[PDB]
A paper describes a structure:
Here we show that Arabidopsis thaliana possesses a highly XMP-specific phosphatase (XMPP) which is conserved in vascular plants. We demonstrate that XMPP catalyzes the irreversible entry reaction of adenylate-derived nucleotides into purine nucleotide catabolism in vivo, whereas the guanylates enter catabolism via an unidentified GMP phosphatase and guanosine deaminase which are important to maintain purine nucleotide homeostasis. The loop probably stabilizes the orientation of the cap domain.
To elucidate the molecular basis for this specificity, we determined the crystal structure of XMPP with and without XMP bound. Consistent with the monomeric state of the enzyme in solution, crystalized XMPP is monomeric with a two-domain architecture. In the α/β-folded central domain with five repeating β-α units, the central parallel six-stranded β-sheet is flanked by five α-helices on both sides. A 20-residue-long loop (Pro142 to Ser161) protrudes from the β3–α8 unit, and a cap domain (Leu20 to Ser89) with a four α-helices bundle-like architecture is inserted in the β1–α5 unit. These aspartates are conserved and important for the catalytic activity of HAD enzymes. Mg2+-coordination by Asp12, Asp183, and Asp184 is linked to catalysis and is of critical importance since the respective mutants are inactive.
Numbering used by the authors: 2 to 234
Amino acid sequence: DFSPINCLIFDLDDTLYPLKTGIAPAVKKNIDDFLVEKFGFSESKASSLRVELFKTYGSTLAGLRALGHDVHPDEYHSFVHGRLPYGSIEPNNKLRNLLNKIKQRKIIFTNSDKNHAVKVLKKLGLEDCFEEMICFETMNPNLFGSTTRPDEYPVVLKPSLTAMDICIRVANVDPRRTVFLDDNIHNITAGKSVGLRTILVGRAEKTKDADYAVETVTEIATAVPEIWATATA
Ligand SMILES: [Mg+2]
């Protein structure tokens, strides 16, 4: 049977640029340094808390608020992303050409704040390629003013199905007609569970929940030939 692809949802970090760029370990270091600044922890204790909060709540920001700390998202993102070596993100001309050839609607779906995402897309040369962006603010629209308690509006992040649902609703996605590209195996599982077709980025081998796997995102031009199909049924 034929299901056309009318929409592509792209993760940002480590999907539209390769993991080996080195942004991901810088973000981990920055989160540890944020916890040292907040709590006067050693770096070693900071790392221990980061991974616990990441595992339990989805991120250190999510966890701090769940535990009763009134950490505004801007404080966190300014520290953790603001400090990043954005200069190390290389433009990808092949990718820009590909996205421009692709006729389907293209969406960004990221846990990062919009400010970070826009900086990354600018470095990549992709700032006009996407017609919707579902970012941290999108998933957490009530988290920027006063709250009754620190966790009145719990932080929503990928890979939660809550996050998936917000992406699908904001972008008005038909999951049967949509492919989702992400480097994170848990995000791929979540996407598959809400009916999306899935492309694991950063591995050549598929997980059980990946329809395709490519090491680099530009490989979809040949690995996913249905992108170029013209049938609509
Ligand atoms: Mg990613």
